[PDB]
Each structure stands twice: as C-alpha cells, then as structure tokens.
Design brief:
Chains A, B, C, D: Its EC number is 3.5.2.6. The structure is a homotetramer. Chain A has helices at residues 59-68, 86-89, 92-99, 107-114, 201-213, 245-264, and strands spanning 23-24, 29-31, 40-44, 47-51, 76-80, 102-105, 136-137, 143-146, 149-155, 164-172, 175-181, 219-221. Chain A is α/β, with parallel strands linked by helices. In chain A, the strands form 2 sheets. Chain A has a 7-stranded mixed sheet. A 5-stranded mixed sheet of chain A has the order 8-9-10-11-12. In chain A, helix 5 (201-213) packs antiparallel against helix 6. In chain A, 54% of the residues are buried. Chain A binds chain C through residues 3-12, 14-15, 17-19, 34, 55-58, 61, 93-94, 97, 114-116, 118-119, 125, 128, 130-131, and chain C through 3-12, 14-15, 17-19, 34, 55-58, 61, 93-94, 97, 114-116, 118-119, 125, 128, 130-131. The complex binds the ligand C[C@@H](O)[C@@H](C(=O)O)[C@H]1C[C@H](SCCNC=N)C(C(=O)O)=N1 (4 copies) and zinc ion (ZN) (8 copies). One zinc ion binds next to loops of chain C.
C-alpha cells in the first residue's frame, strides 16, 4: 500500500537562479541578484544596505557581487525586505551569519521570517527557507538611515501581511532620483473572499494599490523585475520599459479584480 | 561622585492589585481579576478561555479564582490579550507554564510579548514583564473558537500597535448578549505628532475610534474597568453605569484631541 | 551558462513513510509512527504524551492513530523529543497547532528546533523542517510528570548536542517494565576529529555510550527501530530480537571507533 | 485587606554602579565597566569585542568608554558573555540596538538571555532584564575570532547552566599574556541537593572547578572583580593581588563544600 508522500522542494524557473554581474540603477544603487530576482545593494560612506536576497541558494553569489562592488562581508550593515517569502528573503539567515548585518522589518515580516516561511497563510509549509530573526522592528512610515541615506517603509499588505515598499532618494547626473522598491501585488493561487486566515485580504489589497500609486517614484523596481517591466539581462537598457508606480498599481488591480470575479465563478 | 541610578520597579495603585472574588458578567463570562484590572474567564464545554491577566503578580490569584469557578489549571485552553503591556499581559508566561494554555495574538502583540514589554515605543524599558511566546498568530477579523464559543479579533491600533478588541456572543436570561472587550484608547504621555517610532500614530488612533464605534456591542468591558465606567467592587451593580461602545470611543477621541492640541501648545 | 542549483528536498526510504496501526509496547505505551520511525504515545488518566513524531508529513497519520487509541487532538498534553532532526521532530510545529500540546526539551534541542533544523552542525541547511518553540526547558535528570507517569531525561550528546534519552516505568502482566527510549548514537557523515563546530564531539560520544549502558532498562526502544533490533511490521513479535541498552551502546561504540579510525585513514 | 505586593526592582551595591575610566589590562584589553562589575573591551584591527556589559543601566557608560578608546558604536563587532544574569548581561539588548554587534553564546545562555533572565532556575522572576537574542550558538571549546584575536569558550556550568569561561592571548611588553575571563562560581542562595530544576547541579559545579583549574591562565579576571581579588578603583595596581585560576577554583570549591554541609545541617 501507498507510503506517505516524499517532501517536495520549492523549485523555480531557471532564470530566477541565473547569476548576473552588478547592474547600476543609480549613483549608489546596484542590482546584484539574478536575472529574474531583484536584490538591491545601496552603498554608503558608512557601509552597505541590502534590500532582498532572492532565493536561499543565492547567498554566495550576492557576496561575490558585493566584493565586486568593493563591499566586504563585514561592510554589509543592514538587510531590508519586501516580504518574507523564500524567493526574496531566502538567504537572510546565511547572510546574517556571514556578514554581521542586522535585519529591520515590520512585525508581520518578522514573525513570518522567524518561521522560515512555514505556516504561510496560503502556502502552508510548501515554500520554506532557513528562519532568521529581525533585529529592529519598524512601523509604517518609519525612516531607517545608513551613511546618511534615508530609507522609508510604506506598508502595503496583501501579498503577505508584512509586505513593504521601501523608498529612498539616490542621484544620477547630479539630479535626485526618487527610487521606489515596491513589493509584489500578486495573489498567486490565494483564496481572496472569506479566507479565514486573512479575513480583510480584499480590503488590504485595495488600500495597497492606492499606497503604491502615491509613492514618491521617479524610478520603480519590484522583487520580480518583470512585474515593473525591467529586463536585467540587457544591461544598460534594462530600465527602458520600466513602469511607473501608477501603471504598476493599475495593472495589479485589474489582475486582482479579474481574479476575484473568476473566484466568484468557481475557477 | 554619583553612581548610576538603581533600577526602578513598575508600581501601580493599590486597587489595581486588590483581589476580588469572581463576578459574573454573562452566562459563561466572569471577571476574575482585581478590583481595577480586568481579567475575563469564559467557560465552555471544552475548556476555559482567559482574556488578559492583569499584572505579573496576579498569576496565583487568577488560578485561585479559576478553581472557584471549577476550572483546574489544565482546563485553561487559551489566553487572548487586549495588548501586551505589563498591567494586562503581566502573568502570561507563568500562566502558560502552569496551565498548558496556548496564546493567540496578532503579530504586533506577539513581538512585544516576546520582548517582555521592553523597547516599548513610548516607555522604553521602564515597564516590563516576563516574556512569553504567542502560539497562534491571528489576523484582523479572524475567529478563534473554543467549545463552540467564537471570539473575533478587531484590530484597533494606537495604545499599542497590536491593540485588539475581542467580541463574542454570550447569553443571559435566554437572550443573546453581544460582549465587546475593547482595548485601551489612552495615549499616556505619548508623543503624538511626528513620533519617529510611530509615524502614523494619529491616523491609527483616528481609525481605531471608528472601529470601536462599529463593534457589535450589547455590553462593553475594558482592560481598565473605569474606562468603560464599570465598578467591579460593588458586585451585582458593577455594570449599571457602563458606557456604550459609542460613548467610550467619543470620550476617548475628545481626550485624544485635547491632548493633541496641548502637545502643539508645548505641554 | 549554469544557473544556481535548485533546492533539494530531504527524501527518505519508503519504509520510513509507511503507516502502521498502533502497536502496544506496554500497558500505557504504544508505537503509533511508521514501520521504520518510532513515535511513542503514552496514555495517562490526565492526557497523552508523545515522544517523537517522525517526519513532517506524518502529522495526520499520528492524529489518526491517536484517535484509534481514544485520544482526541486536545487530549495530547505533552511532546518530548529524542533530538530535533527532521526525521524525528518533523511534525512538531503542526502537532502543536492542532493539539494544544506543550513541548519540553533541553536548551540545545530547543535552539535547533527553533531553527527548523537549519544551520545544523553537520548537515548545514540540507535537512530542515517547520520550526517549533519549546515551552519548557529541562535539565539533565529532570523529571516531567503527566497523569502520574514520570519521565526522566538523560542527556546523551553526540548525534546532536541536545540528544536525550527518556525513561519511564510502565507495566505489563502486573509487573513493572522500565522502558528506555534511548536516542540515536550514529554519526552519519560527521567529521569527528577537530570539528570546529563541535570540538568535544568525541568526548561527548564516549560519555554518552556510558550513559546509555547505565540507563534503567528492561525494554529498549530507539528513534530508528532497527538500531535496537525492533521489527515494528511483524506486530506482536516486534520486540523479540530487541537489544539491551548494554548491547546497543556496545554496537554503537564499535561502529564509532571504526569510523574514527577510517577518518584518520582519509575515508 | 491586603493587596497583592508591588513588584520589586533588582537593586545592587552602589559600587557595582560606580562608573570608572577605562583601565588597561593588556595591550588590546581594557576594563570599561564599573568599579565592581567587569566589562572587557578587546580592540582589534577589524573592530572591538565586548565581554559582559554589567547592569542594564550601564549601556550609556560603556558606549562613552568605548568612544574614549576610539571605538565608535558601529565598531563594536561582537558581544560575548560569562552568563546571562542581569548584573552581567543587563545591557546586551540596548547595546545590540545601538551598535549592530552580534552576540555569540552557548545554547543555555541563549535561552536564558532570550527570557530576559525570567524563570531563572533559582531566582524565578526576581532578577530580570531586557531580553536579547543570540546570533551565533557556540559549542564547548569553539573558537570565535575577530581581527585575528581568537577567543575560546570553556563551558563551566553551575552558577548558571550556560556559564562560560573565555580565554585569549594578548600581549604586554612584547610577551604573550594568556588571559582567562572565568565565570562566577558562586551558588547564591541556591538549593544544591535534590534541586528538581537542576538535578546534576553538584556534579556540574565539581567538574567546573576542575575546568577552571586547567584553563590557560597567566592573568585571571572574573565578572565580579573581587572574586579574583582585583581592585579596579586603584588603577595601575588593580591587578597586583589577583588570584591564579588554581586559587580561584580552590576558594570557590571550599566555599561550595561548606555551603553544601550547611544545607545538610538545615541552614
Ligand atoms: C511563492 C510565489 O509567491 C512565487 C512562486 O510562484 O514561486 C512567485 C508568484 C508571484 S508572481 C511571479 C511571476 N513571475 C514573473 N514575473 C510572486 C510575487 O509576486 O512575489 N512570486
Ligand atoms: C503603563 C500605562 O499604560 C498604565 C499605567 O499608567 O501604569 C495605564 C495608563 C493608561 S490609562 C489608566 C487610567 N487608570 C484608570 N482608569 C493605561 C491604559 O489605557 O491601558 N494603563
Ligand atoms: C539525517 C540523518 O540523521 C538520517 C538520514 O540519513 O536521513 C538518519 C541517519 C542516522 S542512522 C539511520 C539508519 N537507518 C536505519 N537504521 C540517523 C539516526 O541515527 O538518527 N538518521
Ligand atoms: C544575582 C546574583 O547572582 C548577584 C547578586 O547578589 O545581586 C551576585 C551574587 C554572586 S556573588 C557576588 C559577591 N559580591 C562581590 N564579590 C554573584 C556571582 O557570582 O556572579 N552575583
Ligand atoms: Zn512572495
Ligand atoms: Zn515572489
Ligand atoms: Zn497599556
Ligand atoms: Zn493599562
Ligand atoms: Zn538525527
Ligand atoms: Zn534519524
Ligand atoms: Zn550571576
Ligand atoms: Zn553576579
């Protein structure tokens, strides 16, 4: 008779695991992840900040790219996160061990991070990663500063309860560039209506679309670059087709509304 | 020359520490705390629920009152909290050790509970208690059920980020009684405007007044009974002067608005 | 060019995942795991105790077997562990959520359990499971009692730093049966000499052999039943070939000594 | 009638809270705590290490002394601990928040640190401090290295289960100085025999005396300086009367043996 099933690993498209060399986004800001997963390094006079790490197996690659940018492991001061899913916060535990960086995150992200993504509201235990602890709990609108560069958190719950957009002002050609690293707005296979683990899910998504629309936003980036129409693999032309924050929110809301109607129609 | 100061203990008015016998609120619901701190025991066919415990030194008294109600330590199934301050969640750690109960709380309450109230947004380390872990993380509107009795969480952030109202329907004289255990709405010594640790504090308070106004509410109780005009010490007449949810929110908002104007005026 | 590798799942022999009906070990003690992974249910007048859960996907099966024994989910009071590896503590998180049980474990087991087995001294992140929190920290020789049945912890570090043997006295045919649930003594692929993550590994193993030899031991069981020569699949004859504690320790030490000499010889 | 008692604060002798200027112990090692509580700063080419912090209210003073030594808050890389009691690990949480340092500690110290000293085996909740998380779990004999300086952990359980001695080799006048920072060996008000929370307490103390005797030890320091006969307040003559490791262990064992006999005699 049938044995219980084997555990199944969280697998992803090859391009999500495809290393790339550092790609400059603005004067201090570099994409140092893979072709299809964002990991942003911001370099200051007093150390580096990392926003997202991608998948768990990307830890070594990120350190290699940091070294290419002149950042030794001990020079990484701070890790910030969009949300605590395996494909964005995957390597946080290993990075903390190997760099001495601290993690700052809101309470929702902190508790999910500390479970390693287990008991996810929608995924259960299917998509997990090594747990990590948040060292600083931040609140909506709170400013985290490293080397004079100020990062502001904007809560946009939905994709996870702790979903966060991070904004900061870099420069390029002597002009300020307000960067918005806006979190995911997808609801992949989620039950949207009457979800007992997330009763106000629809209300949170709706508010989060409005939050993204209003972000200070000269240049938008997203945890999955295709969501904001970036193409990291083409190098200097990677940002050419990037969406505004307005267009990113609009596309996400239209997709959400269609999914909601399909759920009412049983599919 | 001066040595560093001694540590100072969190002290409270004597009435907050004054034991009282169990006082029935509805058919299954009892106040079993002290004269001036609420701790509600709800007794079901499949075990008891405790909402708040008061101060840390109240653990033994609560167990005594539980025994008077026929509830042995192992019969306590679940602990719920208004918010994770020393005067309401004080004895949670000891109760968990001595009863085997689980704690359910939202992510904000969970992270503050696990710090024992340390690094409080407003109090720093001045008001602390033994840390405890939440066993179940709950979301806004989520229903927690014990022995058929359904408790619904309503987030009302402000007094703490994790502040929660809990509602449930008990009975009395054959009629349903919608009980609302609404959290504190005070801002004791808080900086309200431009607080770097709580940038959206005013917006959260304002939304929380509206949340309390709309709660299902035949009978209101509050962590400090005087806030809803209860007088536990008079026994059967204790509820006579109790406020509605509408009046509790209105009084709290007027107090908040006055405090905000005083803050603008430097006091 | 090559993408980074996909994550690989922890897979096991089919027999480790092969459900079995409850098999009585003594008057109150039942094997309720799979054919090749031990999970012991001890049933008292005041609730049940579970020693080990096996693999993460065994949670539902264990609850089914508990129901067959008359134990509802809420009747499980306590979970004890041999050691916090995925194949023995795998389902602890889910069991806690679904039963309200508490976990008691020593500090080493607690910290590994709370990492979900990640950053293992020998396995790294290769063999992980959903993290869980210990509710009671126990010390060497400490007695944990449920329904009058006393379980004593005997630390036997080596296989993991937190490896524990649990002993208790059951009955059979009116006579006492001193049961010893002794932890694993294997060192699967471990570096034994000069291991920077475990400098006293050899000394701990050597002491643990002596600890096992001296356990009160009328009947020995082990997390992998083949280690003590049990054959769960044959039912009433399952214990016939079981080893004494003396013989289990002797076999383990001889295997360890041979492995140590092979390590010196480069293999 | 009597209300429940007020919470009582952990108070200490004034000299434990008496700031002192940095006192050099060897070429890289400085006492930067108070007159009667040790806090050792070791300064390397790649950042500073702190061994113990003393009481919770010493955080600001330690940062002041670090600045006097040329160490900015961000230059503190690592915190090590003798044991996780309020008078030695008191300010760890605040130091981590303000410096970005990581904490390394064994599993026993980690779990007590994360409880803020609550549920102490002997003190209960009477002596607590803000909880902090360990970032690196270390094993007996494990080496932690910063800026080329190697610190070795030597477990000496007794005063707490996680009690640790730390050793390292500094220099003075061109000659190596093997420093031993040996933990406390007192048992203040402890029940020694048949303690249900610590059944092997006597055996652990006895082994720990032998451990201290065998430490590499040209210069001994202790968390309470009087325990090793230091007098921090006299400056350059502070080390003159310091005990050897042999004499520290001998004095502690004689005190322990006398206390044990007194316990048998009921006092
Ligand atoms: C665990 C999931 O959240 C993860 C997965 O499928 O593995 C993906 C699914 C959506 S959308 C990704 C669409 N791909 C490229 N744009 C998502 C996100 O929006 O962050 N991550
Ligand atoms: C730590 C503080 O939050 C605590 C204290 O002062 O000790 C009190 C202050 C306010 S209002 C209490 C007013 N007293 C009676 N109604 C408050 C609450 O609203 O929960 N608790
Ligand atoms: C993660 C490992 O610890 C696990 C595995 O290989 O998957 C096994 C290896 C050894 S020995 C098991 C031998 N099999 C049957 N007797 C072991 C144990 O002794 O607990 N578990
Ligand atoms: C909480 C206790 O551990 C603490 C206290 O009494 O406040 C002291 C008592 C002993 S011995 C201290 C003796 N004083 C000077 N040598 C001790 C130690 O050995 O670490 N700390
Ligand atoms: Zn995601
Ligand atoms: Zn994603
Ligand atoms: Zn409060
Ligand atoms: Zn209060
Ligand atoms: Zn194992
Ligand atoms: Zn195993
Ligand atoms: Zn101490
Ligand atoms: Zn001390």
């Amino acid at each position: 008779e049938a044995p219980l099933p084997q555990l199944r690993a969280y697998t992803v498209d090859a391009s999500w695991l495809q290393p790339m060399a550092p790609l400059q986004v603005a004067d201090h800001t570099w994409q140092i992840g893979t072709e299809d997963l964002t990991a942003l390094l911001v370099q200051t006079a007093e150390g580096a900040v990392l926003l997202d790490g991608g998948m768990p197996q990307m830890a070594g690659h990120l350190l290699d790219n940091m070294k290419l940018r002149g950042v030794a492991p001990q020079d990484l001061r701070l890790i910030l996160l969009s949300h605590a899913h395996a494909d964005h916060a995957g390597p946080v535990a290993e990075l903390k061990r190997r760099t001495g960086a601290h993690v700052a995150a809101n309470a929702e992200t902190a508790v999910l991070l500390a479970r390693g993504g287990s008991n996810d509201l929608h995924f259960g235990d299917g998509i997990t990663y090594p747990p990590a602890s948040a060292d600083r709990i931040i609140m909506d609108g709170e400013v985290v500063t490293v080397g004079g560069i100020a990062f502001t958190a904007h809560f946009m719950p939905g994709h996870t309860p702790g979903s966060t957009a991070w904004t900061w002002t870099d420069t390029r050609d002597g002009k300020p560039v307000r960067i918005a690293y806006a979190d995911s707005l997808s609801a992949p296979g989620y039950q949207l209506k009457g979800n007992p683990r997330y009763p106000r899910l629809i209300e949170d998504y709706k508010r989060s679309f409005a939050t993204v629309r209003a972000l200070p936003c000269d240049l938008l980036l997203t945890p999955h670059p295709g969501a904001s129409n970036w193409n990291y693999a083409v190098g200097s032309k990677a940002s050419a087709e990037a969406l505004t924050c307005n267009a990113y929110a609009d596309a996400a809301e239209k997709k959400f509304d269609a999914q909601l109607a399909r759920e009412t129609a049983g599919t």
